[PDB]
Amino acid sequence: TALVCDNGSGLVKAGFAGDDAPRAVFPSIVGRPRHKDSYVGDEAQSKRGILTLKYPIEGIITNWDDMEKIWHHTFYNELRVAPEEHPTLLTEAPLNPKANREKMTQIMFETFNVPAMYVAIQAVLSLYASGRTTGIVLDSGDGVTHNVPIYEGYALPHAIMRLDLAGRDLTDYLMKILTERGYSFVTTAEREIVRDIKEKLCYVALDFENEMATAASSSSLEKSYELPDGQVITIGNERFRCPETLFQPSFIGMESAGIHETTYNSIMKCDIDIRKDLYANNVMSGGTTMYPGIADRMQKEITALAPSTMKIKIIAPPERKYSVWIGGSILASLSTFQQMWITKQEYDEAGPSIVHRKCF
Amino acid sequence: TALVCDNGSGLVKAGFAGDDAPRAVFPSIVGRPRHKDSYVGDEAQSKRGILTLKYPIEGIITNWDDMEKIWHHTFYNELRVAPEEHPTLLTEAPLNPKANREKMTQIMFETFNVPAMYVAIQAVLSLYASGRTTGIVLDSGDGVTHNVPIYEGYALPHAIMRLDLAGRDLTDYLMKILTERGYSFVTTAEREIVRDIKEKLCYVALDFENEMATAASSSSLEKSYELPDGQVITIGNERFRCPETLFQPSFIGMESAGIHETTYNSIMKCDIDIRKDLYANNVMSGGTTMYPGIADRMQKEITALAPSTMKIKIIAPPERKYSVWIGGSILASLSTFQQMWITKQEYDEAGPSIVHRKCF
Amino acid sequence: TALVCDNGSGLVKAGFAGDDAPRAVFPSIVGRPRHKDSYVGDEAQSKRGILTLKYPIEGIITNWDDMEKIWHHTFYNELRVAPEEHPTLLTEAPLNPKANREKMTQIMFETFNVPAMYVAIQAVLSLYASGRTTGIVLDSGDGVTHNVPIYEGYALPHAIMRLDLAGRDLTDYLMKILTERGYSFVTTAEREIVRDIKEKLCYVALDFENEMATAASSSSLEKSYELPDGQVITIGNERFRCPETLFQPSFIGMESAGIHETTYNSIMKCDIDIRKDLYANNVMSGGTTMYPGIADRMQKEITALAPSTMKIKIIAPPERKYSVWIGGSILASLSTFQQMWITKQEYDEAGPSIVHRKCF
Amino acid sequence: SGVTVNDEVIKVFNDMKVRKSSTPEEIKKRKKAVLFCLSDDKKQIIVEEAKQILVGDIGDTVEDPYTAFVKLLPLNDCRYALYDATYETKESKKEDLVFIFWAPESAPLKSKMIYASSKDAIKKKFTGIKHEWQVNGLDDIKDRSTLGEKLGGNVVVSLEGKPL
Amino acid sequence: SGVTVNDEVIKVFNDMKVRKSSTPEEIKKRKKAVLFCLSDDKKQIIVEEAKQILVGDIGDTVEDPYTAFVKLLPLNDCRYALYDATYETKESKKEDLVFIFWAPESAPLKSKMIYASSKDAIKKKFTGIKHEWQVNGLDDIKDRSTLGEKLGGNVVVSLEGKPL
Ligand SMILES: Nc1ncnc2c1ncn2[C@@H]1O[C@H](COP(=O)(O)OP(=O)(O)O)[C@@H](O)[C@H]1O
Ligand SMILES: Nc1ncnc2c1ncn2[C@@H]1O[C@H](COP(=O)(O)OP(=O)(O)O)[C@@H](O)[C@H]1O
Ligand SMILES: Nc1ncnc2c1ncn2[C@@H]1O[C@H](COP(=O)(O)OP(=O)(O)O)[C@@H](O)[C@H]1O
Ligand SMILES: [Mg+2]
Numbered sequence A, B, C: 001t002a003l004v005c006d007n008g009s010g011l012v013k014a015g016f017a018g019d020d021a022p023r024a025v026f027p028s029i030v031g032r033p034r035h036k037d038s039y040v041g042d043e044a045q046s047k048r049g050i051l052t053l054k055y056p057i058e059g060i061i062t063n064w065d066d067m068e069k070i071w072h073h074t075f076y077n078e079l080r081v082a083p084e085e086h087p088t089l090l091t092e093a094p095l096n097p098k099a100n101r102e103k104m105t106q107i108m109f110e111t112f113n114v115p116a117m118y119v120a121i122q123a124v125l126s127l128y129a130s131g132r133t134t135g136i137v138l139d140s141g142d143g144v145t146h147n148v149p150i151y152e153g154y155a156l157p158h159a160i161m162r163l164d165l166a167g168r169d170l171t172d173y174l175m176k177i178l179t180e181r182g183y184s185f186v187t188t189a190e191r192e193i194v195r196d197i198k199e200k201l202c203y204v205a206l207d208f209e210n211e212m213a214t215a216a217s218s219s220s221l222e223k224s225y226e227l228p229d230g231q232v233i234t235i236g237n238e239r240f241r242c243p244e245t246l247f248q249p250s251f252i253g254m255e256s257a258g259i260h261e262t263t264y265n266s267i268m269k270c271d272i273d274i275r276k277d278l279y280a281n282n283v284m285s286g287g288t289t290m291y292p293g294i295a296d297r298m299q300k301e302i303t304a305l306a307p308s309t310m311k312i313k314i315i316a317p318p319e320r321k322y323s324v325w326i327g328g329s330i331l332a333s334l335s336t337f338q339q340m341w342i343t344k345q346e347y348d349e350a351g352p353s354i355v356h357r358k359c360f
Numbered sequence D, E: 001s002g003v004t005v006n007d008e009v010i011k012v013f014n015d016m017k018v019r020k021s022s023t024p025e026e027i028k029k030r031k032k033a034v035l036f037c038l039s040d041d042k043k044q045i046i047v048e049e050a051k052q053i054l055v056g057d058i059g060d061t062v063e064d065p066y067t068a069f070v071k072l073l074p075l076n077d078c079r080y081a082l083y084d085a086t087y088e089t090k091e092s093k094k095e096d097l098v099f100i101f102w103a104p105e106s107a108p109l110k111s112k113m114i115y116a117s118s119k120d121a122i123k124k125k126f127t128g129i130k131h132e133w134q135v136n137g138l139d140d141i142k143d144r145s146t147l148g149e150k151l152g153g154n155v156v157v158s159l160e161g162k163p164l
């Protein structure tokens, strides 16, 4: 048995190795009162008008006194097993600095007293769970969007693009374009409802001008959602105007390239001989690539940038929301993985420096 | 032993803790002659043609020189025990200002010299005595009608509705619609008789138009009441035309919402996630919710306003007339409540400021 | 000659261009009977117990069958001139959607048959009438409060904050804190009197704790107001406890930031090089910034948030109540503005699409 | 406001909230459902002696862990309870524990008031318990679908192995 | 309750309520004050023939438009009237038109009853007229300050160009 605790940007996924899906999915929030000392995860999302909300993984761990709270809430209150009897796999973002990879290993052995651990990369486990070892991985989470080109099982660090537009800034834009209709969502509990409208009713337009010109005359588009108190709100052309922010970031007012051009400027930054085996192997993951019609829009927009003799292929697996977690649940439930781990005795004879040697 | 003195809007209920019902029930009146200096409670209701009647709790205490009279009449002349040997629980209305909660504590310790006291909220003790800690409390008294939504044992102060239509304005309307028949009730002693017709013979119509159209042809409706001098008055369709003022306040000429719409506009003013556990837990109390057929009319009228997928449930307990008092008689007769009280030594070392700290 | 009709959130201001102040100031209300068909403006404020009141500009126009009533009442019954012989400037709120800007132009040319029109932005005309083209505009009206940062004559749309706390929710809070004293204001005609107590006797406390601790012992604070029937009500510490809701919205029970922090979170959302020329040029407008001591409180509270080397300056002009209207009365009475307008012939050759081209 | 919780209650809560490495004998002695009551003089919340469901008694004497939990509760008196729920959502298979405040409408007022004022005194000591559920009438707890209504509403698809 | 208003009255009201583009000759032929009376057989409200004040006659023959309006009204008979008021408030300069029901105490009862029952029949046809003002005694209309009392009370600062 082994615990797999994915250190998400906006959702901590955690479960036991060998399961198909994580047991615990909860926000990466530590909330403190404005004037119990700290509320963690779903408790700080439930309370209203009294808390100030902080994120310790707002994709690189910023605050280690808040991150210890998040992990204490994962083992005891959500997984429901003691950490000193279970080995604990963890995950880190691409481009994580070397000092942050040692402090993540020191907390598991000194604070939580784990018997063994391991730390993997979030982009590599997404590519291995699409049956590939070479391919560019679009990992679009809640708080950060990465393009990681991987050639033969090793991510190329100078070519890793990072876009700061991600699915959290689509929630806080969907509260603006539904305020245009008249639905004045503004509270913390009315942000979770907008985030659940986003999952169930948004989709990416194949062409934005011909869809928005069809949105005036057609009645097929308009949907009806039912709120927690049974009121019915009617969403119209805000279904495709929200995830189109990922392809045109000028809607949310930033000058950054879209996800069809940070993908292209990450293939062009790789060596000349390996670009053809990255054009034909775009692999997607994370919660924000779950929209329908986004594999059909990424293929169209990259093909318009890329030269004409190259084969552009976007691979979207159907369980890509949790592919970083599912890849760490297969790999830690292997019976031949039992000597791969970093044991507590190897920490006692080499300190935090062990993590670079065995979790490369 | 402990005294429980409920500071009623039109009836002071008072008794000893551990009894099922209050020993003393008397009006909240101080009467003074037009030209003994002041008559209190039943004395000022008995005298005629010579007194001007004043109310100090006409639900928030207005006059503290008249309220000291009311409480002096409760301890000595009605309870019949000295206050300096008995601890004294008191009650306050919802939305009572912070200065009025300190002056209520200063009078008990400095004027009456109580050994200990406590002050509770009238809406919270009504909800706890229906076996709930979350639910909207319709507290319809003599002089004021409150809707207090309570979530997890704490009343939400921005959502507390107050309607100024209450059971006292139904007495002074029943003297008008029995003047239509020819029974010229006009004196002070002929107002108490009209108030006793109201208790024994009024009921809420399930549908007003089909009951009033049945009232012309049917002989089942018409009742006969016997006055203190043995004369027999015959009341007809003024049985359901009186408490229908609570559902249509345009009868008594005010523009205010009825008690089936101030209840709804107090659930809609609460946060979106908790409204479903207020729709299914309407709890009633006070003397003016005692009419038969009012739990069956509140369910019908709120269901016609509320959205269709929400479960509307009205809970009427059978002893709801004194549920604020009975809840303070159980809670002050507990043997483990003996360190909860505010003692006289804690007043001497912290002044009136102690009441906020220990009677929250 | 030209008409300038400001489409207010709670007060339609309208007059002829070249005048110093609007001829017509009346509420944005269409009232309909519960069971003439519709009463508009002051007629629906005068009638009592029989009307249900609706707002079509409750700052973005919601109902176009009610907004046609409001404008029909402005031209004929209040301005007193026929619209087909006078060109008509109009105003729109910041963040008004593109479809609502075309329907506003279609009604003027097809229903009212104007010879020419123009549509301006309410925040830009407030900044130009303080002698600036760069500066953050706090526009606090009756129903909505905007912070619009403007750099070189163009409002930055991603940085425009909108707070839903505004001067209408201070009237409905002043009816609660004067109910604490005993003045039971509850009717529609007793809401206009509370709204006139608010104009003449409220002020913003420089420090709330030292003013409210002075309010217990001092006799300088307490004022006396005289009602329409000659009765005298005495207001105490409800003079500064009412507009302090704008700086602490937890009093009215919402979790939103105050107007000293929605101003700060609108400067921080603008580009890094232009924030110093927004800190030193805060400009205020609208009816709800008219309180005395609010330019001295906004400077204190923004300085406590902002870094210490930045110069915080709040500019309050003395005629800021009507600065959006006065700026449209100067600009439409210019003799060189006569080719700026959208004529009826330009509507006939380009439809509603003309408004984007010439009223940018 | 009165009553404190006994330290034998907190030991039963720590056997349910955090589970730990167990023999196949001892994992059949964990508690699926526990009822907490009040002592004879009404000063302390205690663990009720012979009203509990073990995990090892499921599938044999107890056919279903939820239908045999509704039958524990007395219909003329009030209880706290603590139920370890097993539910599968649309995307994930979960397991959390539910605090039930049972207070029927047929109970006397001296047993309805004394638990409503003591609920905050036993909830504070139960760290990390997410699902509170007050229950009054039998009809609100008896059906299987009304537990899955509090747990996820419309996203639960299998509660205690049975589909909804 | 009886009398109807003649269609020559409604034409005079539409010349006052909505003004329109006018030559400097024609804007001096708009009406500042008009008196409406009853016909000889008392079936219809008519425009009275030679009791009216024009806008063009102000500043010459009529020195002041309000002092020369009080002198039109008969002291032994009743009238409706219609006065286009010019008033400046504290913050704004306005112009609205006032419906005056003149019915003095020295008039006979057959001329006091027949206008009080016919007032609702001529008010309904006057759309959008805000300021109703019944007047009985001379002393209540004669002073300038008692018009500004009905119009704004204490917020009027200049009525017909003269300060109050
Ligand atoms: N079906 C969906 N459609 C669109 N967005 C979704 C969907 N499901 C989840 N999301 C979003 O994905 C984000 C969480 O993705 P995740 O990969 O877990 O992020 P992270 O690992 O950065 O915490 C949230 O913003 C969430 O709203
Ligand atoms: N059976 C009854 N039916 C209707 N009204 C009743 C009944 N019994 C009492 N009342 C009324 O209830 C009011 C007193 O209720 P109470 O809750 O004691 O008020 P308060 O606490 O505001 O003094 C009086 O107006 C009384 O006439
Ligand atoms: N002197 C004043 N002090 C405080 N509030 C005022 C004052 N004068 C007007 N107001 C308020 O300002 C609001 C109207 O402002 P306005 O800018 O016209 O709003 P809108 O344009 O949104 O209709 C009303 O709530 C009114 O009570
Ligand atoms: Mg992720």
Ligand SMILES: [Mg+2]
Pocket (backbone or CB within 6 Å): B008, B009, B122, B141, B142, B286, B287, B324
């Ligand atoms: Mg009461």
Ligand SMILES: [Mg+2]
Pocket (backbone or CB within 6 Å): C008, C009, C122, C141, C142, C286, C287, C324
């Ligand atoms: Mg405005």
